[PDB]
Design a protein around this ligand. Sequence first.
Ligand SMILES: [Zn+2]
Ligand SMILES: [Zn+2]
Ligand SMILES: [Zn+2]
Lengths: 971, 97, 182, 97
Amino acid sequence: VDLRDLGEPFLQSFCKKAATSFFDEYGLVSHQLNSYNFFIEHGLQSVFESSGEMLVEPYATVKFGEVSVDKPTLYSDDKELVFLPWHARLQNMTYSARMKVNVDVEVTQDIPIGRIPVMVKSVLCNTTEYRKGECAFDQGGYFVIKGAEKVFIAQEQICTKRLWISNSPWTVSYRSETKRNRFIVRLSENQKRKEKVLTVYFLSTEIPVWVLFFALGVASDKEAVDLIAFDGGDASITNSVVASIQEADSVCEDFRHGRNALAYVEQQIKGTKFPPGESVDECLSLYLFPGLKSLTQKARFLGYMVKCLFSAYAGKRKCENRDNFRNKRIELAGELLERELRVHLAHARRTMTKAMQRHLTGDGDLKPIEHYLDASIITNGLSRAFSTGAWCHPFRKMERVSGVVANLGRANPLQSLIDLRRTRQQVLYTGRVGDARYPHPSHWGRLCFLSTPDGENCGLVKNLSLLGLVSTQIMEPVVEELFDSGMEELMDDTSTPLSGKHKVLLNGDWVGVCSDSDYFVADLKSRRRQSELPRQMEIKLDKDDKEVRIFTDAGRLLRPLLVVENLHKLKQSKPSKYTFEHLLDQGILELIGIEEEEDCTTAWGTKQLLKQQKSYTHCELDLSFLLGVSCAIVPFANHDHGRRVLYQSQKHCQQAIGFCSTNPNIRCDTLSQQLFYPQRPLFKTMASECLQKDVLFNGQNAIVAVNVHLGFNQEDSIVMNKASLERGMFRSEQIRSYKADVDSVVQFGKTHSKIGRVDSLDDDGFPFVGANMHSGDIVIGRCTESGTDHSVKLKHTERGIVQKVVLSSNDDGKNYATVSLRQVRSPCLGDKFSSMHGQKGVLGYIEEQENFAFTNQGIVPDIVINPHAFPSRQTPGQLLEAALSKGIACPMQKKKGKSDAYSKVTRHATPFSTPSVDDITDQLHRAGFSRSGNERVYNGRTGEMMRSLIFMGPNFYQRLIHMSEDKVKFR
Amino acid sequence: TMKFCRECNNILYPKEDREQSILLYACRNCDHQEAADDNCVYRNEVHHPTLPRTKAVRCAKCQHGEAVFFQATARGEEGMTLFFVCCNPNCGHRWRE
Amino acid sequence: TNDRRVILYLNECRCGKKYCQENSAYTVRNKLKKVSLKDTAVEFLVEYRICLHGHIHLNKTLLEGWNISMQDILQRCEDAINSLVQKKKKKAEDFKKMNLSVSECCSFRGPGSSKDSDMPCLMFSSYNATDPDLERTLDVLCNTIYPVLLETVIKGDPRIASANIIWNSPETTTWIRSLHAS
Amino acid sequence: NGIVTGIMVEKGPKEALAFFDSLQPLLMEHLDPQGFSLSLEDLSMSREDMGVIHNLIVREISPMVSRLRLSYEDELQLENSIQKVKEVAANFMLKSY
RNA sequence: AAAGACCAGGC
DNA sequence: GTAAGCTAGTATTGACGATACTTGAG
DNA sequence: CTCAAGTATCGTAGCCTGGTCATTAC
Ligand SMILES: [Zn+2]
Ligand SMILES: [Zn+2]
Ligand SMILES: [Zn+2]
């Protein structure tokens, strides 16, 4: 079926509807909530059962049963009160739930074991069901630890479900969960001029690999070099294998005879430091390649490992670099909380046994189990790790990493949005890394390559793309449904060769072979598009390595794409606005990971690339969804220099003053700022049309002229209008909170005197609502009894009118008070501003209205900037936005005189699919203006027609939080 | 290329006897000898644009005035001579002087 | 790296003829530049006919493209091996009565990648290793002699690592000269 | 700069500063009833000159860059040739006043 | 008090 | 008393200058 | 019977001002 008859605008409308359905179904914080939900539903039980039972012997055995968690409640009275996160914020409490486990001890009841912090809007939050306590602008995903809001930064680790080939001694390595599972094959010289030989580092014991071959059960050297499968030639490979044979014979005397090699690995394993409590046969069935059944299969896997090393040696295979994100997994709340809970669960069990072992020697006299287990160990450890930032090291024991838990910012809703979507590569000494600080081509579609910090964390902290998803673990077994597509068993004879067949690997474990690989993969992918295989299953066909890799584990980065061959199923459908589930269930869309995307030809978003030539398998939804949430909304963002886009999307949008909250009566933040009249931009990108949010933009639409103003706007200064400021442009409200606490001696009181300045205080020690407090006054009166008090005084620049006074208490007996002060500011002569293209500057002059230069309708500018700023900063997009916006706020003069005068109006400016300049200038020409964007203006002080034409138009400007009256200091 | 033992299936090392020129093969696990099919006992593989170009030498064929030069010699002529070759990819022709 | 670098200049106007300064430049470059025997070796073939005889095989074309003959390679191996058995005399007594021989064509042609005729060969042997076993002879001829016979240099000087030609003329006007000419 | 160094070689104890203090507001007040700006026309190279730029790239720069970048660092001929094309582009773009 | 830890602005 | 259960036991992102050791041989 | 040297480690590797927090009880 041709796709030409579907048409291009139909496909654009479908792309917009499909992205809108994505954002309705998933939101922007699904990657935090899904991970926490998986930890509560599954991973908690896996921790408490994988920990295992134990028996103290000076016998008494204990076993952990099933684990239950119940909703957060308050026991202030002996009533059970519902506990909401705003209660936890205002009372300086931690918002947490109780965990119960039922133990079984024999030498049986339910014991409380700790409190775990609850993520807001998760399955344990009481706000999941204009409720009292909620803001409309808020989504979940944060924690309230001791009254403060914290977030997890996702941690990147290497993928340990594959083999890693180095080249420093030419190593190939297998890793797993257990530290007793590490397996290394090395190709080196353990010594003139020895030939390079093969060595095994298993259980901290160097063994020749030929001995391990005959220990696992192989009979002949010819079938051992069949297990390696040299692919012929390559005299270095033949030299290394005959050197390893005649070096195996130089260590054991006739290892090929019955159980000689097995006795050798007995006496080689057992002589180490800390030998394992096992014979070698149970050592092989336990610690050698977990997931394989027979020793035949372990010999086959060792031959495959040696083949991989020899293929990397000859230059036919590449070494793994850890900057390619197909070798990385991403750890979020479940993966980190499991690791943190295992430490304090072990610390609880360890101080349980040495407390029981006294009273057990001491006759039964055994207590109930709630005595021998302290519950505050887990509770204190989790909250200490949240409130200090020191998590546990991923693989070092007894160590602690530091870049894990961050503070949640609430300056505008966009700063809170981008603080929840970050990713980090932690490094040892910051300042000597490889290509970690740079964009790699495997970031495409999943991490933003334009926005990143510029300090020490430049490039090490990444931002998720808009349509990016983090996968989760699949709990159903998948290996038995692989046989239905043409996969066959891995037999046990170690004598049959397997040439021509491709190997299949499920999470790194070899489970079978397949003869035809270009039918196996295409049938698995067809069964995934009809919802009888899981949607997060990654299938990669590898022609050079002759291999089929399948991944079902957690931590992979996914994104949706159109499936071209199922794309004709829209015509026959109905264009009612879709669900995402219905488009997934018909095979029109797919979720695709980084490794599968290497087998994909994707058209560049543009339907005109797709439908002018059909040599493609997929197509993007939009190219601007390659960027993060603060970079995809920037107009003409591919028209500016990259340092400027970085300035806008990482720094200046977090500092703008706009929306703050919709329920400010229960928010006692340190600083809260807000505009009087926030506006939205005139232009419409694709991401802003798809998310349908207004709080992504924080600023005003100011009319900007580009002109010199008596030398007052040099060196990146700006000139503003006095009358536009008096009518309320950029007028700001600011609320500051001053807090104090006492025990429940020092108390709150009037302090009985005027040691500072006490005018507005009542008997309780707090002022009245509506008081006008001045610098030098006393805001909170903590009268120590019989004098010698410690009150709180306003500093030398802290003013305001009292907005509210809040009195809170704790559960452990501590009182808190908070007083909020309201100020109203219009811009003064050193306040800081910036456009949406990285052109920051300071206000240097405020001009009267009748002194400004004016047009033939009487329009004067609000902001005047210098023309020396444009040839040098490389931000031409600021001229193209202003020329577009002026075209869409003007009336169409109707030279045609038809009905639909405003039908063909251009207003998008989406990145990577911007309008051309002929469309922008034709839009300006239809509105009655010159195409070049400038217009004649009269001089305001003398009245004469000025000789130069001036560029004018509306730009979205932002008022930043750096204000002049806060920078004044004197020593 | 290595060859394996006929009855034990193990690697054969050359055990050319003293009294006779046979170049036998033998096994370090069983007792079995065999005269070799091939008389090569060790074949091994080894090995497991930075030359100056001119500025202003015109070409008699093309319009390109850069023709990369090098001192070489021929098989009957003792002593060296300078050889030119024009640098355009469609040209590729070499000439003395 | 900069401590070992030296800029060499040249004279002016052989007999006042055009295109004669670059000829002196490559004359001194061809005298200096180092190319070794392993830059021409392709395979190492041990033969049985005392008993074991090594065949270093060559490439015919790169001998001609650099104007090397085989008696040259015999001389430039023999002087270096007699110096190395003379200089630093311990653990180097493998060259007691070791033998060398040269031929333009040998055509022994072990099992793979034949050139069939005039594959140039540097045969070598040993005579002091009167061994009752072949397996230790293969060790000495493939792990001591064949390493030191590959890194023998044949054309150029053994100490110069590289000697390339730069046209200079960076409109810096003799960046490391002060008063010569215009 | 020559006029100011003439004044400060023969004129006084503060006369060069007095020269600046009288010159600068005069120049601001001269420019203020005229204005100075820049439009989209200043930033739009023509179709002809852009075609010449793209033709010079696809003719000269791209076949060379697949040769001399494969050599090592001493060949910065790339920078001289792209600077020649940049000279052509600057000669085009300085036609706007 | 003193150090850690974080963030911002510059260089 | 905490040494940071015992914890590994080398078995995973840094990379250079700067100082200090176990060889042969005049 | 000592220089050099081939490792064997040590230790610093951006730096400075701001504002902030949260600081093991045994
Ligand atoms: Zn045998
Ligand atoms: Zn020319
Ligand atoms: Zn030969």
